[PDB]
């Protein structure tokens, strides 16, 4: 998704609230990097590091399903209309092709004489 003007540097102010906002973000960024730094620069390790961010990322899609979907309301019901609905959509597509094909075999031949396979 994109707006009329692409965001890259637009709408930015120094002020006082934004100055403390950068101080908050760099504090956590340095906190999570130093625990990596102590684990990276040692020869005694040998092994793939875990990191809590990536484990929770895989757990977000594979798990956390049944604790969710407790307020269904209407958004979940609209997904079922886009879910089992397309099966009903194609059900009348193939059926009209069958009424076209079956009638041609009995009266007014459409199948070629060269046809033999299947």
């Amino acid at each position: 998704x994109x707006x009329x003007x692409x965001x890259x540097x637009x709408x930015x102010x120094x002020x006082x609230x934004x100055x403390x906002x950068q101080a908050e973000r760099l504090a956590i960024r340095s906190r999570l990097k130093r625990e990596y730094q102590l684990q990276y620069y040692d020869p005694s390790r040998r092994g793939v590091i875990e990191d809590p961010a990536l484990v929770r990322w895989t757990y977000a899609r594979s798990a956390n399903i049944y604790p969710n979907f407790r307020p269904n309301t209407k958004t979940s019901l609209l997904g079922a209309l886009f879910g089992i609905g397309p099966l009903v959509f194609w059900y009348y597509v193939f059926k009209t092709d069958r009424d076209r094909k079956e009638k041609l075999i009995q009266e007014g031949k459409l199948d070629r004489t060269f046809n033999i396979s299947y």
């Binding site: 990322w57 895989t58 594979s62 099966l87 194609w90 193939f94």
Partner: peptide, 27 residues
């Protein structure tokens, strides 16, 4: 058999769509 062909026919587009953003290699 007619509806059961169509049930397996949609188990081709939608089964391949999920298998694009999946994180697990075994999945």
């Amino acid at each position: 058999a007619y509806p059961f062909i169509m049930l397996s026919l949609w188990g081709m587009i939608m089964t391949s769509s999920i298998c694009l953003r999946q994180t697990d290699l075994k999945s």
